[PDB]
Amino acid sequence: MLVLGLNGNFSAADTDVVPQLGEVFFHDSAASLIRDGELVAAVEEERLNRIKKTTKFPLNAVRECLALAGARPEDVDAVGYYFPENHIDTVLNHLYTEYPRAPLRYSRELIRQRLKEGLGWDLPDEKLVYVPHHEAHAYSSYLHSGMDSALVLVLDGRGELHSGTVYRAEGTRLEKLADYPVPKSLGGLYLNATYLLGYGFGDEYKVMGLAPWGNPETYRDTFAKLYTLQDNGEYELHGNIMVPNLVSPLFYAEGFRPRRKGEPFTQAHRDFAAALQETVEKIVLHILEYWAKTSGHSRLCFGGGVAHNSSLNGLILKSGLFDEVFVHPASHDAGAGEGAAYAAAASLGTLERPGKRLLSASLGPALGGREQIRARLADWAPLIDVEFPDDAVETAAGLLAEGQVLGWAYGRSEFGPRALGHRSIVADARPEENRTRINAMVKKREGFRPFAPVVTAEAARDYFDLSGADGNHEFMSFVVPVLPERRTELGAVTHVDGTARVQVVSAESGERFHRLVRRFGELTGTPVLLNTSFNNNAEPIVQSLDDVVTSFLTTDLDVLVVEDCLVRGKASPDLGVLVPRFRPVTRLVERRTAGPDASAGAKTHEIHLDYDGGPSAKVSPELYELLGAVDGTTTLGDLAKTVGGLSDALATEVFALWEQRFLTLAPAGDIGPLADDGT
Amino acid sequence: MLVLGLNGNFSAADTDVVPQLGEVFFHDSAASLIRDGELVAAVEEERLNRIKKTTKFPLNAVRECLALAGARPEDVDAVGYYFPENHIDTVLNHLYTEYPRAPLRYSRELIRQRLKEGLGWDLPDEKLVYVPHHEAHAYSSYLHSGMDSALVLVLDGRGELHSGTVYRAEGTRLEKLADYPVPKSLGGLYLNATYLLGYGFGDEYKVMGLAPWGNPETYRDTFAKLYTLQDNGEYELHGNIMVPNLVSPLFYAEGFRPRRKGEPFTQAHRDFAAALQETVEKIVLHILEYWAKTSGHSRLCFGGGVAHNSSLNGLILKSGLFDEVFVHPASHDAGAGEGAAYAAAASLGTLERPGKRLLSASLGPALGGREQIRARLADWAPLIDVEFPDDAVETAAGLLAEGQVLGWAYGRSEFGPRALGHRSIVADARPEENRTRINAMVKKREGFRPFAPVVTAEAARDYFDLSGADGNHEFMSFVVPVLPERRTELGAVTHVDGTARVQVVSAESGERFHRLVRRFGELTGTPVLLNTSFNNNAEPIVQSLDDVVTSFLTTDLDVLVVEDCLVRGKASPDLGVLVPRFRPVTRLVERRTAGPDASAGAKTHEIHLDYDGGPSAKVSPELYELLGAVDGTTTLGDLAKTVGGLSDALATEVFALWEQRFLTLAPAGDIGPLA
Ligand SMILES: COc1cc2cc(c1Cl)NC(=O)C[C@H](O)/C(C)=C/[C@H](C)[C@@H](O)CC(=O)[C@H](OC)/C=C/C=C(\C)C2
Ligand SMILES: COc1cc2cc(c1Cl)NC(=O)C[C@H](O)/C(C)=C/[C@H](C)[C@@H](O)CC(=O)[C@H](OC)/C=C/C=C(\C)C2
Ligand SMILES: NC(=O)OP(=O)(O)OC[C@H]1O[C@@H](n2cnc3c(N)ncnc32)[C@H](O)[C@@H]1O
Ligand SMILES: NC(=O)OP(=O)(O)OC[C@H]1O[C@@H](n2cnc3c(N)ncnc32)[C@H](O)[C@@H]1O
Ligand SMILES: [Fe+3]
Ligand SMILES: [Fe+3]
To answer: Where does the chain bind AMP (chain A) (predicted)?
Structure first.
């Protein structure tokens, strides 16, 4: 029983189903493979096409999943899609009314076309199963919990008909107890509010990071006009006929004006974030109080995108409403894609479930066999120096104890947004200045936001207040208080209100990462590291060896540890050996606008990425000429000869484009097919 | 007492308030000027910036209105804006949350900035009056009716709070009787359905033109699921939570697929149009049946964008519900801008109203005086031959009787969408083949589209069934039946269902055009002409003399009659003497995407117009290089030297860009300030 789970939209690599398809139209595309009821592989398409939360069809994700399973496409018994067919097709139909030149291709025909063209797979119609959206969520959240029954709450922006759903789960049976309609969306409320902070889709976590800096009392009575808690776990959100945003009209009427790009957060902005976070907490605890009492259940699984609000999750943990709480590492739509595979297996009879509670999110493609890794790092030699220590973990622990910030890349990439010891950046958690330091190091701007700690299972209760319910901490799903007498010791990872989003690593959840944190604890007396994701501000979490080396060379980390190899950048890295390649969305443009007296105006050159929200950058006439000659095989240095050679100015210009990922820059060739490592 | 009426958004000529600001965000920007209660000038900005139904701030329209009134900015006593301040600002604020780089400039600051930078006019806060949207519509529609009491119905997509409002009007006082909420919008319903036919905003009257070719039975029971008529003049529209379109989910579930652009209109599409039109007719007549008997009014004024549904209007006319019906030539938001002037005047003193019923929409800028027109036509000499007949109307009537298709441009341009004898294309109304060809060859549009007739007031009842209420036909507001015994005679202007959107012209509504139609009737026996708007498919109604001549030369017209000059295109016209100029929205781009094996793709070159819904076109590398040198003063022939001379291929390529209006091509200089 080999079942593929699919979520996302249907766009090709280089174009979208309609031009500039909005970033929220079926996002976080991913592919998941289950076999005999176990999740054998899962990866988000964003890791492979390098577009954060991409909506594009997850063709590469499917290819990677089939290879991790040793399967041909034709081996797949069924395909589950995370929305009902009529809903996705009606939304596509609406996009087609807005773009009358777009050919009428609905979801079943598009899925069949992408798989046939992209993999030579003729998918028979009877193998494609469409699934109710919150049902897919609930299966993913509950089947990995290891509980034999639970109350299951799903909250997100919306499924086909609901913004929230409540189930009772028993064995492999879901029974729906309640639902909440689309206009009551809490994910909708949170995203509406996020826009008022100069932020957008995918920035909700930054708003949650900002909330503890604010006073929730300032706007408490304003938000109280936008919701009413009601009897029997009900609630209302009070809409308006002015604009498609629940929040902006009332706040505008009271003089609140939205933050502009590059403007610093005012006290009003911090307070707004606080009252927003308090509002959603109050509503969800209202829901859960009613359904805990009504169902009588002591266990909760919480899924949907709203369940990535780890602040909310820590409040649920401390509420005493439940004895146990489980949250999946991918509770957003990538996890609904996984859940859609289980629902498809159930639809076709044979629903087999995982034998254990999920402990490791390490489920994507690996970096490769060590012989092809060694070989590929040699291709990077003009830019890096490599050491091959005898005990890389031991060396890494000492470097960390000496105060260096490390890139840490091992094995299979994490499913879901948190890095957990496979595509991570780690450093000493004690020094508070590591916050400003490592933020500048990776060109990010979340200094207001602390980093997440990782602690050994053994030491976990020596530093963190896990009490209340028994929650799962292998994925940083919960904010917990830092013990008051350890707060000053844990300066980099403790928030302004004394809390932290802790990963508890165990020998079972991640053996190598556990050994690393334990070893550092032996060396310093503090078995706590900070653990942030391995990516700069212009990319999702790095996936391949080439991605890892690129991100290392374009950030200011001290050392990279990748599959026992110690990597450092040469004193003068030779960019000229790198072969530039366009990404499928790269566009290179010379533009003339209108000028004064109706002349042809200013003539500028730019590079940009052709997707909704994609970045763009000005380029010099010289680099424009160089990049226009990119052929995918000639090196940057050889291409630069046509404009006089790779000057220091050009190399610096190229490097800044590299940092923003406008195009691929890597040595010639590639690492080759990922090795069958026998696991 | 001089009052400016304003409507539209606040964008500059070359950018929008946010990038790619949607075409429906405060559209049909216009300016109107009233003086002592009379409308002295009105023009839509689309005529001046050449962007159909533009949302850009109507800066040119204000300047032109002041010139027509002989006024300086400082003479203006007040400025009315056609929406309440809190509503437009809340929408602006929403756009600013989606575009965090946009500075927080709201409507009051934006209006004052545009008038200061654009006209040197410092507008005091106390002179800017914001007006409820349907109130503005109602003043415009009622005060021009010549009625001293009436029921006034406003139906559009939405105002600030309502999709529909019903007023009692008596003297100069409006009293609200009823309103209908935003989700009951009939304008929204019609636009939602328009999108299923491969059309967009602005195409509603094409759907209306399609409907008589369909059978409303096919989809009658489908549309019946989308609305319910209720007691005492009420109704409901039944929404959905799947997509922001009332119509498309149900019709998708029943197997109806949206038409693609550039594909035929099938019988299912025609049937869909017919059932939509019947649906809106049923709802509006339900509303009006109730409010006619309840309010006790024998006379109706109907405004809002829905009142440009001339089929609906003709049914209202035949319903027997009213004795008289009036519809303003600009019943869409440009007319709400005019109404906002009357409201602003009412808020700062007693309201002065027009003395008489409006008979003429000839209210925009004229073409110029005789001397400057003749001199400017001399600038076009390398492209045109010009004759100066003793009696140009006599001559034009003869050319029409001989089968010629004429451009006709005289005096001040029409306010509102219909051409009425000031910026018109006219032809013999008798041969059905004229409809076939003027659709296919001249306007280049769909073969199903009707053509509208103009008839003399003296002969109107010889050809059209005007029975029922007394409606005003000076602006083609009403579809009426063509008398059965005249349908064969009027082959080009009788629609498939035997009706026509008639203009009745009189010596009082348009003396010159009436003389033309009457003389044609004396020559042929038939005092009826085909009258379509003077524009190709890439442009709004032509405004200036250069606009008129450019449009004549790029559409297949036989002859142009412009202010008594007979213009024909030269045998071999010299495009090399035209001076290319960029429009403020013209853009030129050389572009590479990705190519095979992650290479840079092959370069392509394009010209496009930078606004939401703007066209684009590929251009040769040679023309790309030529257009990059455009300076606004050098001729096309001189510019082409740098690419080795204006070859035949380059002239042909340039001509096709000119026809789509990607750039301005006109002789050196301009006509000067209009005399
Ligand atoms: C212009 O056309 C629209 C616009 C909206 C709605 C719909 C349509 Cl057709 N109609 C739907 O049905 C939405 C659909 O199901 C969908 C994209 C679901 C994904 C998988 C959710 O994850 C997204 C969200 O929840 C999102 O916030 C992040 C809310 C977006 C609402 C909107 C973007 C408003
Ligand atoms: C994404 O942001 C939106 C979107 C919508 C609505 C609003 C907002 Cl903020 N909220 C409004 O209030 C609209 C406002 O009042 C307005 C533009 C009024 C003009 C003058 C009307 O003429 C337009 C129409 O009637 C139009 O179809 C032609 C309907 C468009 C509705 C929409 C395109 C849906
Ligand atoms: N079908 C569907 O809706 O997709 P989905 O399961 O992937 O959840 C996305 C939603 O979770 C919301 N969301 C994401 N992070 C959030 C956070 N930290 N707090 C609140 N809401 C959040 C986000 O704003 C968005 O509304
Ligand atoms: N504030 C506001 O809404 O502006 P507005 O007065 O300018 O009218 C626009 C509305 O008239 C509708 N509309 C335009 N032509 C129409 C037609 N022939 N039939 C029905 N609706 C029409 C159009 O679809 C749109 O919904
Ligand atoms: Fe979801
Ligand atoms: Fe209106």
So the answer is: 187, 204, 305, 309, 333
Question: A633 CB contacts (<8 Å, ≥6 apart)?
Answer: A579, A668, B597
Which residues does B391 contact at the CB level (< 8 Å), separation at least 6? none
Residue in B with minimal Cα distance to A665: B598
Regarding whether A518 and A469 lie in a shared domain, the answer is yes
What lies within 8 Å, CB to CB, of B421 at 6+ separation is B408, B410, B454, B503, B505, B510, B512, B513, B516, B531
The partner residue sitting opposite A592, judged by closest CB among B196, B584, B588, is B588
Same domain, A368 and A449: yes
Residue A224, domain CATH:
3.30.420.40
Q: Do residues A272 and A221 share a domain?
A: yes
Q: B615 is written with which tokens?
A: 């066209």
A430 within 8 A of A413, measured Cβ to Cβ: no
Virtual CA dihedral for B297, B300, B306, B312, nearest 10 degrees? 100
**Total residues found in chain A within this entry:** 679
The secondary structure element, H or E, covering residue B513 is helix B511-524
| Residue B381 CB contacts under 8 Å (≥ 6 apart), including other chains | none
Residues in B touching A632 (Cβ below 8 Å): 595-599
B432: which 2 tokens?
């059905």
B397, B516 contact by CB (below 8 A): yes
Partner-chain contact B587 A592, CB within 8 Å: yes
Residue nearest (by alpha carbon) to ligand 3 atom 18? A309
Mutate to test the pocket of ligand 3, among A179, A191, A477 (most ligand atoms within 8 A of CB): A191
> What ligand is nearest to the CA atom of residue A276?
3
Which domain does A490 fall in, by range? 363-569
Question: What does the block give as tokens for B355?
Answer: 């003395």
Query: Resolution, in Å, please?
Result: 2.1
Cβ–Cβ below 8 Å for B248 and A97: yes
In three-state secondary structure terms, B554 is helix
Report the DSSP pairing between strands A324-326 and A470-471: parallel
- CA B9 – ligand 2 centroid, Å: 12
Cβ contact, residue pair B89, A584, below 8 Å: no
